[PDB]
């Protein structure tokens, strides 16, 4: 139901994977598929986006940022480690595991559902939301419908969880999620966002999610 677990690594240098891919190919005895896209993420910014299919890798880079690029990967398959070590050897880059803080987890939740159409109209793919806490464990759940009626009554926001769901959880319930140890955010049949990883039902991540990840690791 939710098969794909993603791990995130920040990279000290921005990479042009086109210029080394043949060495990886000779290393693995196969021809990897490498897709390259220049993507735009409106705020109602531009990124270079690599995708490597062998188990999958996704790279997001931005030259006008201090920490210019990160990668994320899913599957296993130990060839992922081969890929990582190959990157470290071929490019001489420093890579570190990415851990998502609570605020960043909420931003991640917003990025997972919010998108913008051709005529710059905001749209939100709504799912039932489950907030998991661990100081002992307890969770709160807001069904899809309630979430939708919550979005409309705020109303227009690129951050429905931070602008609507959570403050409403304060007003009517009396709970400050910001004051509580949030360990997981579950969007039913879509995505689970944790501190150290993101799980998805599909074999990909929203571009907005990638953008939020890259923006979060800026020293």
Curated annotation (Swiss-Prot):
The keyword Ribosomal protein does not apply. It comes from the Eukaryota. GO terms for biological process: ascospore formation; attachment of spindle microtubules to kinetochore; cell division; establishment of meiotic sister chromatid cohesion; establishment of mitotic sister chromatid cohesion; maintenance of meiotic sister chromatid cohesion; meiotic sister chromatid segregation; protein localization to chromosome, centromeric region. It is found in: Nucleus; Chromosome, Centromere, Kinetochore. One of its GO terms (cellular component) is kinetochore. Keywords: Cell cycle, Cell division, Centromere, Chromosome, Kinetochore, Meiosis, Mitosis, Nucleus. The keyword Cell division applies. Component of the kinetochore, a multiprotein complex that assembles on centromeric DNA and attaches chromosomes to spindle microtubules, mediating chromosome segregation and sister chromatid segregation during meiosis and mitosis. Component of the inner kinetochore constitutive centromere-associated network (CCAN), which serves as a structural platform for outer kinetochore assembly. Forms a heterodimer with IML3. CHL4-IML3 is part of a larger constitutive centromere-associated network (CCAN) (also known as central kinetochore CTF19 complex in yeast), which is composed of at least AME1, CHL4, CNN1, CTF3, CTF19, IML3, MCM16, MCM21, MCM22, MHF1, MHF2, MIF2, NKP1, NKP2, OKP1 and WIP1. Interacts with CHL4 and CTF19. Present with 125 molecules/cell in log phase SD medium. Belongs to the CENP-L/IML3 family. This is Inner kinetochore subunit IML3. It comes from Saccharomyces cerevisiae (strain ATCC 204508 / S288c). The lineage of its organism: Eukaryota, Fungi, Dikarya, Ascomycota, Saccharomycotina. The gene is IML3.
